[PDB]
Each structure stands twice: as structure tokens, then as C-alpha cells.
Amino acid sequence: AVPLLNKKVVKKRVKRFIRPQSDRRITVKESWRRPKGIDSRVRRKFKGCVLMPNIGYGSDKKTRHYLPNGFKKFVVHNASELEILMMHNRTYCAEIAHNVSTRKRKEIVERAAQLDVVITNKLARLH
């Protein structure tokens, strides 16, 4: 399958937004939280501090949610759901759900080859 997308993917930022002071404290997890403190230097955006996520970082709508291979992911749990991508094989690629058995993955992979549907994790748990 030849991906239909042609515009290059431009990531405004590739680093993640780490919660402030999650390095200092084990109990403070890395998932982002907006600092609400009155004196918070991060909230006040002093230079040399952690950056906060804002809408300006939004990616181009034409390349948003596109994988590096040039397709968009759709999660499939069986062979029937795979057939939904027959007419979108140049736009959407399939990914087999993490909990599908190896026996049922062989059926999905074989069916995807007939439909020319890209499978992102076709080598999963077959050894």
C-alpha cells in the first residue's frame, strides 16, 4: 500500500511536558499537571523553568495523528473489523489489539495481506 499523505510531518515539539518537580519527589508523577500555586515560577513562566503545554504547540491538522509510516492507526480485534479498512488501505493502517490470541492473529495477518492492509504489529507473539 502506498500512503496517500504527501505533506511532511512537522513536529513543533518532540520532548514531553514533564510535571514540575516530578524529578525531586517520587510521589509526584510525571503526567502533566498545571501548577496552581500563587508563587509558582513555572506558572509565571520565568525563563529557565519547565515549559507548560499550550494550544500554540498544536500540530498541523493535515498531518495530525499520522504515524511515521504515513498512515493513521485503527485498532482491530478480529478479522471482521479488519475488513472495515478495505476501502481506506491508503489512509488507515491496522494494529491488532494487545490481547488478541496468537491463533487469531494469524487469521488477521493473512486476511490483511489479501486486502493489502498495513499491519503495524504483524510480528507480535508468533515465535
Binding site: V2, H65, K72, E81, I84, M86, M87
Partner: protein, 142 residues
Amino acid sequence: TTVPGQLVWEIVKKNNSFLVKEFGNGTAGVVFSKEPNNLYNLHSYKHSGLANKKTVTIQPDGKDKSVLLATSKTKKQNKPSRLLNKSVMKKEFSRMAKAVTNQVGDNYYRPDLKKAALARLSAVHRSLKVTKSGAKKRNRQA
């Protein structure tokens, strides 16, 4: 369907057993429809197999690379067992392509679905060839 199609779309566009949604209702949201009479499997009033009296079905038929071309009968909207006018085709692609163009566009059945039907026929026909013999090209060039 027995009621106007526009009314049906207002009802089933939010929730129906054939609606497949993934990745929530944000920007990541992806929506598909999997009713057998939806050529592109798209969740739209144009392609919906539930909210249109005149719909096109193209899918593999049984064995021997046969392709089923079924259209919904306009006067049988209240008879599910007799709603489909099936036509099993087992000839060359060119012959099948003409039949689809005749039963979709020439008779003014669903001229807006002529392009989708031919692409649907092209996709179904190609998959039947690969099943019989197996994958031989990766189709990755270009």
C-alpha cells in the same frame, strides 16, 4: 426505511449497532460504519446503508471469485427478506465494471455512488485474486 431517509439519519447518526468509534471524541476520534450496504464503510448520510432507500452492496459471494452486486428494491422497504436484488457475477472485471455502471449510474439509481461502487468492485475483485494465488507484490512502490 419505511420512513424518510433523512429522518432515519437523524436517529441513527449518534448511535447504532454498526457504528465503530475509536480514540474517544477528541481530535483522535475515528469513526467507521460496518453495515454490508455501505460501500466505503463511512459514517455519513451519503454512504449510510440505513438511511437510504437506494443502496449498493458489493462483496464476495460464496466461492469461485464470484462477486455479489445487490441493490435495495424501492418498493420492498418493509420486506427485509426480499429487499435485496442480488446479482452474482463471475466474469471478467471489465464485464463486471459495466454491470455496476449499468445498475448504479445508467438507470439513475445512485449516480453519486458510481465512483465508490467501481472502487468497491475493484477492491473486492483484487482481494479475490490474491486469495486464490496469494500475495506476490508488496504494492509499496510509488
